[PDB]
Amino acid sequence: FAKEIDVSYVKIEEVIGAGEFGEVCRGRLKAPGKKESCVAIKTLYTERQRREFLSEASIMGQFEHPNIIRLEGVVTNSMPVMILTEFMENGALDSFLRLNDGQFTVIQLVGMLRGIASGMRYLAEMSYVHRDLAARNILVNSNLVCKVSDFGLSRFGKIPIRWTAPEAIAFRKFTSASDAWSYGIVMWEVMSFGERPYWDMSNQDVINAIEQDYRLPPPPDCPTSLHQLMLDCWQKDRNARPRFPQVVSALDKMIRNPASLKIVA
Ligand SMILES: COCCNC(=O)c1ccc(Nc2ncc3cc(-c4ccncc4)ccc3n2)cc1
Ligand SMILES: [Mg+2]
Ligand SMILES: [Mg+2]
């Protein structure tokens, strides 16, 4: 593995959350010749489960981008198995926004979406299909920088219906274009300050609604240009959806022309 670290360099500070295979902790990483850094630690079962859990670390270690969670290291030679990443002070974006409901400006929200879109642009360029892009899988640092998290080389836990493109649900064809659909859902989550997508519907109702041309309405106070970008991401034809460089360009144009963001339906 790339970034194997001696367990003596890690001090676990406190449990900060619950992950899929175990606890999420905050800790301190101090390696010889390097400054001490704050880390988030995921601790871990069968051999296939261990290889799947560690597959997150394998791919994360091959990415380097300001909007992609940074791998600091892994503990595999010793037990328990750990994945260490940079610590993100504000945690998951959906809960962060619910805590701060209506407290960030449209320009700040657009900056967060631009950061997510830059991370996705990088992944699509690397031919990496996320498949689980959702606000709960975005982490936020003290400066409000949004980073894509939740990596893995495993195949579908269950398909996250509410965030998945219709061709991906129906034919299990996951592409950067189905991630563009998911990104549209993330835009809606952000502009709604962490509301659950299709909150008043079940998974089967969502599958039926989407197939029957229903699309999420603009969140309260959402600029029309942002809801139009959502509708573009939600085109039934995957080839008609904007690619991530187009998404970033559209958001940069909004940031540059804030008067456009004043138009609300
Ligand atoms: C005492 O607990 C109170 C509740 N917890 C928080 O407020 C909280 C705040 C910040 C974060 N930050 C954080 N920072 C980085 C993370 C990184 C991962 C991760 C992802 C993939 N592989 C390994 C780790 C998971 C969660 C992560 N969470 C988490 C919880
Ligand atoms: Mg780089
Ligand atoms: Mg996932």
Side-chain angles (χ1 to χ4, degrees), residues 2 33 66 70 84 126 139 179 181 186 241 248 258:
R70 186 174 64 183
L84 283 77
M126 296 294 281
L139 294 163
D179 281 345
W181 176 290
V186 173
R241 296 171 199 149
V248 180

Side-chain angles (χ1 to χ4, degrees), residues 1-10 12-19 21-22:
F1 282 93
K3 292 188 171 195
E4 183 70 38
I5 53 112
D6 181 26
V7 81
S8 75
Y9 303 166
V10 195
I12 298 150
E13 304 257 273
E14 61 175 320
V15 182
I16 61 172
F21 292 116

Side-chain angles (χ1 to χ4, degrees), residues 8 14-16 30 34 50 80 83 95 103 106 113 123 128 146 165 168 187 196 210 225 233 252:
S8 75
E14 61 175 320
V15 182
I16 61 172
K30 180 61 190 75
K34 293 167 99 168
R50 204 194 92 113
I83 301 168
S95 56
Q103 301 158 50
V106 170
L113 287 171
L123 297 175
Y128 181 82
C146 294
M187 293 180 71
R196 183 189 196 201
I210 291 308
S225 66
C233 290
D252 286 337

Side-chain angles (χ1 to χ4, degrees), residues 66-69 88-97 109 111-120 123 130 132-141 144-151 163 179 182-183 185-187 189-190 244:
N67 303 100
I68 298 301
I69 287 295
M88 301 290 281
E89 302 91 344
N90 292 311
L93 178 66
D94 65 320
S95 56
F96 179 62
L97 293 180
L109 297 175
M112 292 178 193
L113 287 171
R114 199 266 185 205
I116 296 157
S118 181
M120 294 308 300
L123 297 175
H130 193 282
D132 196 15
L133 178 60
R136 65 187 145 80
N137 290 326
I138 306 299
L139 294 163
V140 184
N141 74 7
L144 306 186
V145 178
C146 294
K147 307 190 189 206
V148 181
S149 183
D150 181 34
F151 298 101
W163 288 270
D179 281 345
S182 305
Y183 179 83
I185 302 296
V186 173
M187 293 180 71
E189 290 184 279
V190 172
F244 288 107

